[PDB]
Each structure stands twice: as structure tokens, then as C-alpha cells.
Amino acid sequence: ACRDKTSANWRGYSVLVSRYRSLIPNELFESLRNISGEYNINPQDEHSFF
Amino acid sequence: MDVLSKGSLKELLAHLEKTPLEEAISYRIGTVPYQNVLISRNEYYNQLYPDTTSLIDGVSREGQRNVNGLIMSIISYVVSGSGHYIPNIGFMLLRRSILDILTKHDTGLVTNNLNYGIIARNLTVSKMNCEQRKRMLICFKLLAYKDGNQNDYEIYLNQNIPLKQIAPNFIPGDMRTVIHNQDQLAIVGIPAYRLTQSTELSIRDDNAKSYKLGYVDWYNSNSFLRERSEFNLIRLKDRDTKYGKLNGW
Amino acid sequence: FLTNTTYDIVNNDTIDVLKMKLRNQGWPFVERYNAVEIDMSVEPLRSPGQ
Amino acid sequence: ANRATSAFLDNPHPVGVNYVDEGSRQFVAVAELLASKLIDSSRESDESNSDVPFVQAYSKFADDNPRHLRVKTGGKMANALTNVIRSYYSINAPAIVPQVEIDRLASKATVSGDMYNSYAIFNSVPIVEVLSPARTTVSIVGSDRADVTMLNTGAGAANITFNFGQIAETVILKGSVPFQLARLNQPMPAARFTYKLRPLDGPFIVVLPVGNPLVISATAATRIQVPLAFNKALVESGFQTAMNDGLFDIQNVNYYSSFDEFIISQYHAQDGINRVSTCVILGLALQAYDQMRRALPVRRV
Amino acid sequence: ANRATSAFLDNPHPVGVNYVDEGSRQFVAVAELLASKLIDSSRESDESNSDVPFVQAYSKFADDNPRHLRVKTGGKMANALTNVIRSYYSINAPAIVPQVEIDRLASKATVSGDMYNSYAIFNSVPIVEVLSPARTTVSIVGSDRADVTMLNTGAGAANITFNFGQIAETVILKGSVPFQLARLNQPMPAARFTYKLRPLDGPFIVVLPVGNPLVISATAATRIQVPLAFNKALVESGFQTAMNDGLFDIQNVNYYSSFDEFIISQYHAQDGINRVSTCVILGLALQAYDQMRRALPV
Amino acid sequence: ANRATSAFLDNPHPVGVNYVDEGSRQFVAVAELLASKLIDSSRESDESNSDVPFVQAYSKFADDNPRHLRVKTGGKMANALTNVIRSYYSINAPAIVPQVEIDRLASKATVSGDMYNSYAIFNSVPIVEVLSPARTTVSIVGSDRADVTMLNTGAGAANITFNFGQIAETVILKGSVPFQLARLNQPMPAARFTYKLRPLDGPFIVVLPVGNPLVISATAATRIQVPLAFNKALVESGFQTAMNDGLFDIQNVNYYSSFDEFIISQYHAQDGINRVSTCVILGLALQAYDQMRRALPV
Amino acid sequence: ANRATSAFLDNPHPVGVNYVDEGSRQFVAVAELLASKLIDSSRESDESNSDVPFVQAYSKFADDNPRHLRVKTGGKMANALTNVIRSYYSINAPAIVPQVEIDRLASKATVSGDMYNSYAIFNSVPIVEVLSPARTTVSIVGSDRADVTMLNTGAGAANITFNFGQIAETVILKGSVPFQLARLNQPMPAARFTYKLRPLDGPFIVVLPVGNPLVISATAATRIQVPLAFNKALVESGFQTAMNDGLFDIQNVNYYSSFDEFIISQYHAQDGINRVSTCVILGLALQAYDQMRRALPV
């Protein structure tokens, strides 16, 4: 079920990432390359997401 | 790359404990150490760029089979990140750690006749920077204490005033001296200045920038270890602790 | 979960050993998969473009 | 008595022994693939009146977005490719490219460094030696098509021995007038214009009658294993570009008129099996050099 | 009077008479189309991490799925294409392939099979005969570039007659030193380096002064109708590969350095227009043979 | 006097001194085991119409999936095995196999590196020296046969001596005509066709009749400790393949017709007990080389 | 200028040009696989008490259920295999088995007809010619190991030319006493016991000491592409079995001691490439014949 949902709905998320990237100017993007971080997700949230 | 990123004496000495001698050997043929060559640097000049090859480089070079070559390949690994080609070393030596080679009598290598002035000329010292020279003096001090030639270390330091000023201050047998050291020995690291992807002229400079840009990519890769975010995932052996001690010492 | 073991036992175990344990049990999902890079451009308009 | 040999077959200089491992071959294969995209993107940019496809392709090749004033040359990938090409040509080359750079560049594309996927036909005529009697004169000219002009001043018909080597597969011989040719210790056939020979059969004897000179034109076909991305037209252009830019001016090396003559000459030498493998990698690297330099021109007249 | 002729023009052996019908021409064109896909799919599969494009292309070509243990020979199409090539070269070669297999293989793709919609320019220089006076020695070397070295030992100038045939379109003559050349029953023009001639104009007379050997370089161009898919670079590679594989080994045949040399010789022989019709189909078959064998080497 | 010695016993070159530790011996045993599975999975996949058994075997051996349009060399294990073999033959051959690579490859399967748990019989006959008096000529031919031709052409009995070394266990002598052989100061026995000898007994002295030449055929057997998974048939073929592939091309080395001649010659050289230990490891590696190369020709 | 040649290289007779298609090669491979099942099942049935495993194997092989009273001969497969073996050896064989029978037999098991996925090494040393000077007697015996004995009666040293057929890969020469050997117009090296040679290099020159005979032992290795199920031990046994059973009795046909000499002799003929392919198919068929005949002694 995860694979079927992934294959059917990957086009929308690929377009969504592009639209978000197009909202950032080049100067601001270069600064964000310096920062770093790690996101912690609960196991229940990840499985429910896919 | 990993060796060149070590900043403290504790981190460098710990790395030499884990790393076997085989990483100091290259297994690649390389070319002759000292030779005047014409190289291509098209970003700056159309004419070929003259340069002289040296032992302290990021590339393999031919090295003598004797104990002198083995010591030189260890130092070149620490200061440049790449060793030399010494053919047919026994498996017993290759599995030993670098620190054991420099600071233990169990290995069959005899180093008592080592001359520090000759080695410093072969591994060109007029070409090294301050951090590279400090790393070399660490290797010389470890060899002197294992051999008992601590006086020969001091006479060598007195003949070269700038080396004496920047000589790291530690006792190769006491861990308390290592912890107290405030010296910085990081050839590669995160650059405060702006680092571009342009090439450099000299072989040493271009090779060093390759390591510098590689470390930045390695910094942002998944192989890098982030202490502030994953400290509980680390094994107890590799976790940063105040009571961490080298074997013996 | 898949093999009858606890966290304390599988501690100090390398990645290769853990992969061998899971493959023998019959579990094939023991590897990471790299993501493909999508080449994106932003049209200039008034700005130079990115 | 007299011995005549081809000019391009004499004294093949040793080739490099570095950057011949699996990781290095991947670096060469990646460079060729990314250089091909560079040429294609530049053509597409001209058609669409936008520099975006070229800027996007150059970013993958050079890992940087170019500035207006700074000249575009390819960055680290161009620097590594140019120096590795020099290392392949001769032993005396410095070979000053670190392994960290090679590994990083090889990771840009998911391609395999396979240099034995396919074959190519190299039409250079190897004439190892042509042995002639005392009163006969033999001159050998040309490499792609060798014209052997032999004149018999002696009183009677002479026998001239041809040695084409053992590497070539097929050698076709044509003469100005019909002539007689047969293998060693075999009957002479009737005079014919054309002979098809296997170079492995043995030394061949030609009969030179007294009178007008006889000119024999020679053509050979040799098959050498090459990658599936090999293109002989692009390799030859890259060989000329490298020679003109001065990448091959090393001491104690031999200069060849074509990559056809280079690869055949190294084949016709001791340990030539190992030499050809290195020369094949040099061929693909030269193919990458030609595509990259055509898309990024630096020299002006 | 002495006669000198080009070495590649003598005794053109007869060509095959089989596999020249419409169904066989379709099979050759279909073979070229599917061989082109094999090479392109090979590069696509190598570039990416999936061999799916190669499996799809090989399945169409060989009617079977590739297997790791088995050698990728090419299937029934590879066997058929090789045998048809042998049949074209000589009339003595057997016609092994049945027509039912050719029709089945020709149904894989929808192609016209017309082999005379385009043209190609061929560079072989036909020198049918060079007639020289008694004290004159004449030698002809080369096919793509013909060097005619002429020396006269007589007291006066000699007239040497050139005959380039009636098939070549244009012939360019260049000399080491300027020389005199004119058609029959025409005044001699002043000495010039370069002459452009139409071979159909007639025999050409060249004046040869005493001493100072004169060598004439000849380059010719001929137009032959070929399919639009024709590629001279790929045809030449197939000719050498087929010759090296022994596809042309058969009793009582003539061997040529290039397909350029082969097709010109057949054109100039008796019954030439119908000979070059078969040679063109052989050229397209060799172009397919070169592409298939590079993707699948054995 | 005249000295005649066997050809293959002369000047055994020094053997390699690398990859003889417990860890390296384990890798060679693993290579032999995994190569055997490759040849077995190859046959099963051919019969079963599916390539599943071969893919699993190749993945273990090469650490990557089998892919079309690839040479299918064998991965890093094939490279490690080839370079390890090269180091064994000569002490001058460079050792270019990393120790970490050996440990990683040896971890694929759990095997013991014992090389003394079995034995094999080698049929090369060590004719160390044959001393002959004047006026008579002796020639030694062969390695398995060891036919020795002797002619007297002298009034008195030749009374020559044989030496087979102290290594071979049994040596069987046969002759064209019956002959008598004794143990130095021993009474000459009745002339018979055959003889059975223990080479440790001592120099064997034989007399030669004046009349006709005598030819003696010697067959020997030697016992050398080898691992359990040691097949002499596979080692002989692997030895021939390695010489053809050029693995033994180091300068200042000696070449041998077969593996039995190689192992016997190293045994009879000074310090032979340690040399045979390296030779048997080379034999096991050569066994793996043959099985893997036949499965994956290159 | 006397000429000395090997016995088995003289007059290689033509082989059959029938049963060489993909379907025919599939039948030979299917026969070998089903013969392996037959002999293995017979061993299993002998070990156990029941005879069912033999019954099932014979049912597949002979298409009929075995009966206690009736004799077991192998059925249709035995007749077809025996007939196809006759056709391979000579072009004069009747070749009577139909193609429809061949296709039906090959459908029993799913096995590839590939004959080039592996390789085997053959030891027959080819000595095509040993050009000998006057007052120089040359004798050459043996096929697996060649013994070349040469005498020079005169005072002057003699040079002898060795030609090794340029088909073999490596040849090792061992002499009774050290001898000097070099190529044409190369300098003479010091006397050595053993030389490693490449036949492709060219004719070799050997100098003769005048005092005593010098005898050279020659061994050669040649690799030939063979199917992955090849077994030289079983092939040689089947080759002898077929010869004793009169399977090779045809007029104007030469006979060979072993299959090694058979395949090497034809590889040195003018059409060596085409003949070896058929000979390889015969070898696999011989392997199936030996396995089936040992299981069914009839």
C-alpha cells in the first residue's frame, strides 16, 4: 500500500518542492546552506504519512 | 582527509591509535619524488606551468624500502593525507597501528640511527606550513622517546629557532600533558573565509584544496558524525568522555 | 523484532553483521536508497534567474 | 640485405602505468558522458535563446555557477582530465592527480568503466620489415595506405620478403601492374592485381621483374576492443587538439600523426597487450577532451 | 603504345541474384532500424542504473529475452542477416535463408524498403586506361587519390591520353608542376595546376615535356542512389568487419579495400546499373551488421 | 665422470613470502568454496530455465548483481585472487592486495584455513643425479616417464650409480631388457625387469651390459600434506590457465610444465619444508582460479 | 634440408556439415543432461533397495517403461545419438536421422544449445615442421609430450628451425642438457635447461653441440571454447568407446589416439575455425554416449 500510494502521488510532491524552491531568492538560499539540522519524527506519524 | 581534520593533540593521537599502518602505505606506483615537471593549469595560463614534485603531496610517490622510507611515509600521511609506495612489507607490520610503530618496541623496526635533519630535508620542511610542521614535530618526539634519543631531539630543535618556538609541548608517556595542550593542528576544516571551486597553481596547493573541498562535502554527508544531535546513538567506546585515555600513557 | 534478540545483545554489532542476520532470517530491506537529483531552473523575469 | 620498415612503427615510447584501476576508468567514463551533455546543452541553448540548459549542464560538469568576467574552462574536472591525459601518454609524465579528486569526480554519474564492451577497426598498415636483395631499391611511404615502390636494377628477377607482423587481421595488396606473390616455400601463382592475405600465414615473397618499377599499395584492418561509447571521429579530433595545445610535449617521446598510428605502434611492441589497454583509456579521455574544449573555447587567433 | 589501368577496376566478380525482391529489401531496412535501436538502447542502459531499455531492444531483435548464462548472439535475425550478406557478395554463395523466415522478420517494423530515394557521393577515382607513347613510362597508384607518375625519355614532347570512364560526375586533376591538358581536337591551354573535367566530355590529352617527372593527382566524385538511412561511415566499418569475419571468403571472387572501391568497380563493368542495385542493398545490410555486432560482439 | 640430472629439478626460484598467514589462508579457502558454488549454480540455472541460482552465486562472489552489457569479471574477489596468485609465484612480485580487503572477503563464508588435514600423491620422479664413468653416455628424458637411455661402448661393465633423493617415498624401475641393481656394497641380484625401491635406502648402483643400449623407466610417488578440498585435476588445469593468462611473467623466474613438477622442484631445494607450504596454498588458489574463470571467461 | 612433422597433424579429414544448427546443438546438450540423470539414478537405485529412480530416468530417456523380460537399449534417444555421432566424424556418413525426430527429442528438457560459454585446455603439442640441415637427423615422437632427438655428425655446429603452428598459446621446452634457443635474427642467450615460448613469435633456432645427442621435451597448452558441461575425463573415455564400437569406421578417414589430438589436428587445418565448432559438438555427444553406455551396457 505504501508503494502504490508513493507511485501514484509522487508527481504532486515533486511539483510542490519546485514551487517552494521558486519562492526563495538566491542570496537567502546561499545563507541557508551554512545551517544544518536534524528532524525527529515519531514512528506513528511517518507510517501514517505514507 | 580524516587525519587532516584532527584539531587537538588528543584527537590526532587517538586517530593514530585506531588507524593501521596500511593506510600509510599507498599500493600505487606513483612517480619519482624529486623531479622538475611541466603541468597543465589552463584556468590561468595557456603555457604549461613549471613545478617540482615533492614527497609531501596528496599523491603516491616511490619510497625507499628501508626503515627511513617507512617513517617518511607515516609523516607524509599525517601532513599531506597520502603516503608512499613501499613494496612488500610484512603483514605483521601492516596490521599494527601507526602509534605502535612510532612508540613501541614490539615491532621489529630499528630506528636508533635516524637523523632528524636528513628526514626534514627529504620531507621538504621549507615548503610546509605551520600546522604541517607542528604535526611533523609530534612524530619526531614520539620516535625520540621510544628510542631514548631525547637529547638528539633537543639539539635538532636548538639548530632551528622557528621550530623550537612552535614545537608542541607534551610528554609522550603522560596523558595529562596531552589533555592540557591547546595547539591547533587542523589542516582541513570548515572555512570561515569564502572557499570557491577554482583550481590552484602548485601541486601542493591544488592537492590541498581538493582535500579542503572534499571535507566540506564530507561535512554535509551522512557519514559525518553530529554530536549535538545523535550523541545517544553513539557506541560507548566512541562517545566523547573526559576520562578517555590512550592505551598505556 | 524479526530475530529473537534484545538491544543489549545487538549492541557493538557492525552494519555488515546486522545485514547478515536479517538476510538469513529472510528480510531483504537492509539497504539505503539514494535519491535522484531533479534539475531545476527559475525563469529570470526581472531578476537574473537561478 | 637491405631492410626497410615503416616510420611510425619505430621505437614506441612507454605509456603510463597510473590511473588504470577501476575507479580511474569510471572517472574517464563519467567525464565523457558529462562532456557529451555539455555539447548537446549548448546546441539546445542556441535554439531556445536561453542559457539555462548550458548553465545547468556546466554546473554538473564543473560544480560551480560561472561568473560573467571569469573565463569558463571546466573547473576541477577539466584540470583533472587534462593532467590524466598527459600521464597516459608517457612514463615521464608527473601523474599529480590525487585519488580523492578521482573518487569524487567518478561519483557524479552512474556509469561503468568498461573498456572491453565492443570493438573498433583501426586501418593502419604495419610493415615490420621488407627484406630486399642487393641490386633492388625499396621505399615505404604512408601509414593509412602504404605505397611500397620497388625497382629491380639487377640482372635477373629478385625475391623480396614482406613481414606484416602478427597483430593485423586482414591485409589487402594492390599493384600498379599484376605481380606474383606467394607464401614461403609455396608455388607462385599467376600474376594478379589484388591479393587478400592473413598476416599470420607467414613472410610473403614477391617477384620483381627487371624493368619498370612496381608499386604495391597496402591496406590493413585491425580490431581492438573499445568501450561502447568509443567514437573514432571524436578521438582523432581530440588527439589533434591535445597535440596542438602542447599536452604531449614530454621529453623522450615519439609523436604520431594519428591515434590510429599510436595505438597500432604500441600494439606492435613487447608487452603490447598491456599497452593497448592503457591506450584505449587514453582514447576515451581524448574523446572527452574534444567535446569539452569545443563547448568551452579558450584560444583566440 | 602502353596501357595502364586502375588496379581496382579489373575483373569485377558477379554479385548475387537472390534477396532482391520487395520482401527482402524490407527485411534489410528492418534490420537496420532495429540494429540502430540496439546501439542507442545500449548507451541508454549503460548511462542509467537499469538495463530495461536494452532488454526491450534485444527482445525485438532476437525474439527472446536475454539471459546471463547465454551469449547474446542476436537470435534468428543475426543468423539471417549474416547469411544474406554472403549471398549478395557472390553468385556462387548459397541462399540458405528461406523466404518464409525473411517475411516473418520483415514484419517486425513498418518500413518502406525503397533503396533509391536518396543519393551518396563516392570518391573512388576510375582510370579506365592511360595510353602512353613508346619512350614514356606511366604508373597509377591509389584509388581514393590516384597518383599518375609520368616520365618520357624521348627527344620531344609526348601526348598521353586519359580515359576516366563515363560514370564519374567530375574529376579534378592536380599536378606537381603546371601542365597542359585539353580534349581531343582542341587547342592546348596554358600550363595550369588544376583542371576540372567532365569524364563524359571525352578522352583527355596531356602534354609531357622532357625531363622533370610530372605526377598528376586525381580526385573523382560519383552519385549513386541509396536509401535515406545510408551512412557511409557505418557502411565502411561493416565492410571491414564482414571481411575480417570471413563473410566474403568464397572461391573465385575479387577483394576490395573499401565499399567505395567495391561499388565503383561493379558500376563500370558490363551490366552495371543492375549490379549497383544489389550492391546498395548490401551496403545497408553491412550498415546493420556493423551496428548489431558492436552491441553484441562474438 | 659424467653427471646427468633431471631438467625440472634445476634452480628452483624463490617462492613468495606473502599471504601465508591464517587470515590470508582463510580467504583462499573461501575463494575456492565460493567459486565452486558459482560453477554449480551455473549448471543448475542452465537446466532449470531460470537464472535465479546464478544471480545469488554471483552476488556473493562479486558483491554486485549480474548486469547485461557488462564483462562479468567477478568483482573485487576476482581481482584479489589474481593478484594473490601473482605474489605466490615469485618473491620479486609485488603484493598489492590490501589486508582489509582480504578480511572483508574472508568473512563471506565460515571455513578453516587448515592446510595439513589431508594428503595427495604426486607422480613426478626426482632423479637428482646419475653418475657415469667414461666412454658411456647417459640421457634423462621426461618428468612423469623418466626414460633414461644408456649405452656402454666399452669393454668393462659401466657400473653407474643412481640418486633419487631422500624425499620420494617409492620409485619403480622397469627396463627394456632385464638388469641387475644393488645398494652400493651389496651383492648383485638376479637380472629382472622390475624393481621397487625406497630412495632413503641409499645410492643405487646398476651395471650395464656391453651389448645393447638399456632404457630404464622410473615411476615415483610422493606424499605432500594438502587441504581436504584439494583436487589435482582442477589444480593442473588452473596452473595451465595462469601461465596462459600471463600471471607468471616475473623476470628471473623458472617455468614448469605442470604443477606436480613445480611442487616437487621446490621440495628438493634447500629449505623445502617451508616452500611446499606456500606451494600448496598456491595450488588451492589455482583451483579457485580455474573454476571461476571457466564460469566467467574473460 | 630435411623436414620433420608430427604424425597426427598430417591430412585432417573433413568433418560432417550436418546437425550443426541451434536445434541440433540443443539435442546434444539435452542428451548429455538426461544421460547424467540416468547414470546418477542407476547409482542411487543400486545403493537403495528400490529401482524406481532408475525407472523414472529410463522413462524420460527412452520414452517407454522398462520391463524385466525385455532388453533395455535406450529407445529412440540411443539410436539418434549413435547416428548423429557417425555424421559428425566424417562428411561421408549417411546422416540418416530426421530433423523432426531431433526437434521432438530436444523438447524433453529446457537446455541452451550454447557451445561457447566456457573453455578447456588441450595438451597435444603441435610441431608442424622441424626444418633440419644436412648431416642432421631429427626424430619426433609423442603427442601429449613431444620427444625430439637430434644428432649432428659433422664437426660444425648446426642450426635447426622449429615451427609450432602459431595456434598454440604457450609451449615449454625442456632439454636433457642445457641448450641455446632464440628467434630469427635475435642474439643467442646462454645455455638453459628450460625455455618458455610463444608460438606466435615465429620460427625458433636451436644450436647443436656436436659431442652428444640433445633431446627436447615439449609440452603445449591450447584453449578452445567448449560448453560449460564439458568434462575432458568423460570425453576421452567416450572417444575410446566409440572407436572400439566401430562408430568411426568410414573409408578415407584418419584415426587419432585421443580426442585431444583430434581437435588439435583439425584446428591446424585451413578451415580450422569452422571445423573446431563441429568437433566441439562431437565431444559433448561423446560425453553423453559414454555416460549412457556405462549405465546401459548393451
Coordinates of C-alpha atoms in Angstrom, one line a residue, chain E residues 18-288:
Chain E
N18 CA 18.9 -13.6 -54.5
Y19 CA 17.2 -11.5 -51.9
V20 CA 16.5 -8.6 -54.2
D21 CA 12.7 -8.7 -54.1
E22 CA 10.5 -6.3 -52.2
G23 CA 10.1 -8.6 -49.2
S24 CA 13.9 -9.0 -48.8
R25 CA 14.5 -5.2 -49.2
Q26 CA 12.1 -4.7 -46.3
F27 CA 14.0 -7.2 -44.2
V28 CA 17.3 -5.4 -44.7
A29 CA 15.7 -2.0 -43.8
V30 CA 14.0 -3.5 -40.8
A31 CA 17.4 -5.0 -39.7
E32 CA 18.9 -1.5 -40.0
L33 CA 16.1 0.1 -37.9
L34 CA 16.3 -2.5 -35.1
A35 CA 20.1 -2.5 -35.0
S36 CA 20.0 1.3 -34.5
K37 CA 17.7 0.9 -31.6
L38 CA 20.1 -1.8 -30.1
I39 CA 23.1 0.6 -30.1
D40 CA 21.1 3.5 -28.7
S41 CA 19.4 1.4 -26.0
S42 CA 22.8 0.0 -25.1
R43 CA 24.1 3.5 -24.4
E44 CA 20.9 4.4 -22.5
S45 CA 21.2 1.3 -20.3
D46 CA 24.9 1.9 -19.6
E47 CA 24.3 5.6 -18.7
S48 CA 21.5 4.8 -16.2
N49 CA 21.2 2.1 -13.5
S50 CA 18.6 0.0 -15.3
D51 CA 19.1 -2.5 -18.2
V52 CA 15.4 -2.3 -19.1
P53 CA 15.9 -0.4 -22.3
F54 CA 18.4 -3.0 -23.5
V55 CA 16.2 -5.9 -22.7
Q56 CA 13.3 -4.3 -24.7
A57 CA 15.5 -3.7 -27.7
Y58 CA 17.1 -7.1 -27.6
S59 CA 13.7 -8.8 -27.3
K60 CA 12.5 -7.2 -30.5
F61 CA 15.8 -8.1 -32.3
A62 CA 16.2 -11.7 -31.1
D63 CA 12.6 -12.7 -30.3
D64 CA 13.8 -13.9 -26.9
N65 CA 14.7 -12.4 -23.5
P66 CA 18.4 -12.1 -22.8
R67 CA 19.9 -14.5 -20.2
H68 CA 23.0 -14.1 -18.2
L69 CA 24.5 -17.5 -18.9
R70 CA 23.8 -17.5 -22.6
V71 CA 25.9 -15.4 -25.0
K72 CA 24.0 -12.6 -26.6
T73 CA 24.4 -13.7 -30.2
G74 CA 21.4 -11.8 -31.7
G75 CA 18.9 -14.5 -32.3
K76 CA 17.4 -15.6 -35.6
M77 CA 17.7 -12.1 -37.1
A78 CA 21.5 -12.2 -36.6
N79 CA 21.8 -15.6 -38.3
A80 CA 19.6 -14.4 -41.2
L81 CA 21.4 -11.1 -41.7
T82 CA 24.8 -12.8 -41.9
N83 CA 23.7 -15.4 -44.5
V84 CA 22.0 -12.8 -46.7
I85 CA 25.3 -10.7 -46.7
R86 CA 27.2 -13.7 -48.1
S87 CA 24.6 -14.3 -50.8
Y88 CA 24.9 -10.7 -52.1
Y89 CA 28.7 -10.7 -52.5
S90 CA 29.0 -13.6 -54.9
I91 CA 26.6 -15.6 -57.1
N92 CA 28.4 -18.7 -56.0
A93 CA 27.3 -18.3 -52.4
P94 CA 24.3 -20.4 -51.4
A95 CA 20.9 -18.9 -50.5
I96 CA 20.4 -20.6 -47.1
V97 CA 17.6 -18.4 -45.7
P98 CA 14.1 -19.4 -46.7
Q99 CA 11.7 -16.7 -47.8
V100 CA 9.2 -17.5 -45.0
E101 CA 11.7 -16.5 -42.4
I102 CA 12.6 -13.3 -44.2
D103 CA 8.9 -12.3 -44.5
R104 CA 8.4 -13.1 -40.8
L105 CA 11.4 -11.0 -39.8
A106 CA 10.3 -8.2 -42.1
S107 CA 7.0 -7.9 -40.3
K108 CA 8.6 -6.6 -37.1
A109 CA 8.7 -3.0 -38.3
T110 CA 6.8 -0.9 -40.8
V111 CA 9.3 0.4 -43.3
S112 CA 9.1 1.2 -47.0
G113 CA 12.1 -0.7 -48.2
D114 CA 12.8 1.7 -51.1
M115 CA 16.5 1.9 -51.7
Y116 CA 16.6 4.6 -54.3
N117 CA 15.1 7.7 -52.7
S118 CA 18.4 9.4 -51.7
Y119 CA 21.9 9.6 -53.1
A120 CA 25.5 9.4 -51.9
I121 CA 28.8 10.7 -53.2
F122 CA 31.6 8.1 -53.8
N123 CA 35.2 9.1 -54.0
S124 CA 36.9 6.3 -55.9
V125 CA 38.8 7.5 -59.0
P126 CA 38.1 5.4 -62.1
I127 CA 41.1 5.4 -64.5
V128 CA 39.9 3.0 -67.2
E129 CA 43.1 3.3 -69.4
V130 CA 46.1 5.7 -69.8
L131 CA 47.6 5.3 -73.2
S132 CA 51.3 6.3 -73.5
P133 CA 54.0 6.6 -76.3
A134 CA 56.9 4.2 -76.7
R135 CA 59.6 6.2 -74.7
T136 CA 57.1 7.1 -71.9
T137 CA 56.7 5.2 -68.5
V138 CA 53.3 5.7 -66.7
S139 CA 52.4 4.3 -63.2
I140 CA 48.9 4.6 -61.5
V141 CA 48.9 4.3 -57.6
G142 CA 45.9 4.6 -55.4
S143 CA 42.1 4.6 -55.6
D144 CA 40.7 7.4 -53.4
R145 CA 43.6 9.6 -54.6
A146 CA 45.2 8.4 -57.9
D147 CA 48.8 9.5 -58.5
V148 CA 49.8 9.1 -62.1
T149 CA 53.6 9.4 -62.4
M150 CA 54.7 10.0 -66.0
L151 CA 58.2 10.2 -67.4
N152 CA 59.2 10.5 -71.1
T153 CA 62.8 9.9 -72.2
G154 CA 62.3 10.9 -75.8
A155 CA 63.7 13.9 -77.6
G156 CA 60.3 15.8 -77.9
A157 CA 57.1 16.2 -76.0
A158 CA 54.7 13.2 -75.8
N159 CA 50.9 13.1 -75.8
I160 CA 49.3 10.9 -73.2
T161 CA 45.6 10.0 -73.3
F162 CA 43.5 9.8 -70.2
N163 CA 40.1 8.0 -70.0
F164 CA 38.2 8.3 -66.8
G165 CA 35.1 6.4 -67.9
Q166 CA 31.5 7.6 -68.5
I167 CA 30.2 7.2 -64.9
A168 CA 32.1 9.7 -62.8
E169 CA 30.5 13.1 -62.5
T170 CA 33.5 15.4 -62.0
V171 CA 37.3 14.7 -61.9
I172 CA 39.8 17.2 -60.6
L173 CA 43.4 16.9 -61.8
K174 CA 46.3 18.5 -59.8
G175 CA 49.9 18.3 -60.8
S176 CA 53.3 18.9 -59.1
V177 CA 54.1 21.5 -61.8
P178 CA 51.7 23.3 -64.2
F179 CA 50.9 21.2 -67.2
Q180 CA 48.9 21.3 -70.4
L181 CA 45.7 19.3 -70.9
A182 CA 42.9 19.6 -73.4
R183 CA 40.2 17.4 -75.0
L184 CA 40.5 15.8 -78.4
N185 CA 40.9 18.2 -81.4
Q186 CA 41.1 21.2 -79.1
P187 CA 43.9 23.8 -78.7
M188 CA 46.2 23.3 -75.7
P189 CA 45.6 25.9 -72.9
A190 CA 48.4 27.5 -71.0
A191 CA 50.0 25.5 -68.2
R192 CA 47.9 25.3 -65.1
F193 CA 48.0 23.5 -61.8
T194 CA 44.3 22.4 -61.5
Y195 CA 41.9 21.0 -64.1
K196 CA 38.2 20.3 -63.7
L197 CA 36.8 17.9 -66.2
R198 CA 33.6 16.1 -67.0
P199 CA 34.5 12.5 -67.8
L200 CA 31.7 12.3 -70.5
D201 CA 33.4 15.1 -72.5
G202 CA 35.9 12.6 -74.0
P203 CA 39.5 11.4 -73.8
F204 CA 41.9 14.0 -72.5
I205 CA 45.4 14.6 -73.9
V206 CA 48.2 15.8 -71.6
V207 CA 51.5 17.1 -72.9
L208 CA 54.6 15.8 -71.3
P209 CA 57.9 17.7 -71.7
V210 CA 61.2 16.0 -71.5
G211 CA 62.7 15.6 -68.0
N212 CA 61.2 16.8 -64.8
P213 CA 58.9 14.0 -63.8
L214 CA 55.2 15.1 -63.8
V215 CA 52.8 13.4 -61.3
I216 CA 49.1 14.1 -61.5
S217 CA 46.8 13.7 -58.5
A218 CA 43.2 12.7 -59.4
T219 CA 40.1 13.0 -57.3
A220 CA 36.6 12.0 -58.5
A221 CA 33.0 12.1 -57.4
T222 CA 30.2 9.8 -58.4
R223 CA 26.5 9.9 -57.4
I224 CA 24.7 6.6 -56.6
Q225 CA 21.1 6.3 -55.5
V226 CA 20.9 4.9 -51.9
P227 CA 18.3 4.8 -49.1
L228 CA 17.9 7.8 -46.8
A229 CA 19.2 5.7 -43.9
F230 CA 22.6 5.2 -45.7
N231 CA 25.6 6.3 -43.7
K232 CA 29.0 6.0 -45.4
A233 CA 30.9 5.8 -42.1
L234 CA 28.9 2.9 -40.8
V235 CA 29.0 1.1 -44.2
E236 CA 32.8 1.2 -44.4
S237 CA 33.1 -0.2 -40.8
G238 CA 30.7 -3.0 -41.7
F239 CA 32.7 -3.9 -44.8
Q240 CA 35.9 -4.3 -42.9
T241 CA 34.2 -6.2 -40.1
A242 CA 32.4 -8.6 -42.5
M243 CA 35.7 -9.1 -44.4
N244 CA 37.5 -9.9 -41.2
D245 CA 34.8 -12.4 -40.1
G246 CA 35.1 -14.3 -43.4
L247 CA 31.7 -13.4 -44.8
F248 CA 33.3 -12.8 -48.2
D249 CA 35.6 -15.9 -48.3
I250 CA 34.5 -17.9 -51.3
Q251 CA 36.2 -19.2 -54.4
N252 CA 36.8 -17.0 -57.4
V253 CA 36.0 -13.5 -56.1
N254 CA 37.8 -10.2 -56.0
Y255 CA 38.6 -8.4 -52.8
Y256 CA 38.5 -4.6 -52.3
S257 CA 39.9 -2.3 -49.7
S258 CA 36.6 -0.3 -49.3
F259 CA 33.0 -0.4 -50.2
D260 CA 33.8 2.7 -52.1
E261 CA 36.2 0.6 -54.2
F262 CA 33.7 -2.2 -54.5
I263 CA 30.7 -0.3 -55.8
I264 CA 32.6 1.7 -58.4
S265 CA 34.2 -1.4 -59.9
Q266 CA 30.7 -3.1 -60.3
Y267 CA 29.3 0.1 -61.8
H268 CA 32.0 0.3 -64.6
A269 CA 31.6 -3.4 -65.6
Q270 CA 29.1 -4.7 -68.1
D271 CA 25.5 -4.8 -66.7
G272 CA 26.5 -2.2 -64.1
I273 CA 23.3 -0.4 -63.4
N274 CA 21.6 -3.7 -62.2
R275 CA 24.8 -4.6 -60.4
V276 CA 24.9 -1.4 -58.2
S277 CA 21.2 -2.0 -57.4
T278 CA 22.2 -5.1 -55.4
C279 CA 25.4 -3.5 -54.0
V280 CA 23.3 -0.7 -52.4
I281 CA 21.2 -3.3 -50.6
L282 CA 24.4 -5.0 -49.5
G283 CA 25.6 -1.6 -48.1
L284 CA 22.5 -1.2 -46.0
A285 CA 22.9 -4.8 -44.8
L286 CA 26.5 -4.1 -43.8
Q287 CA 25.5 -0.9 -42.0
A288 CA 23.1 -3.0 -39.9

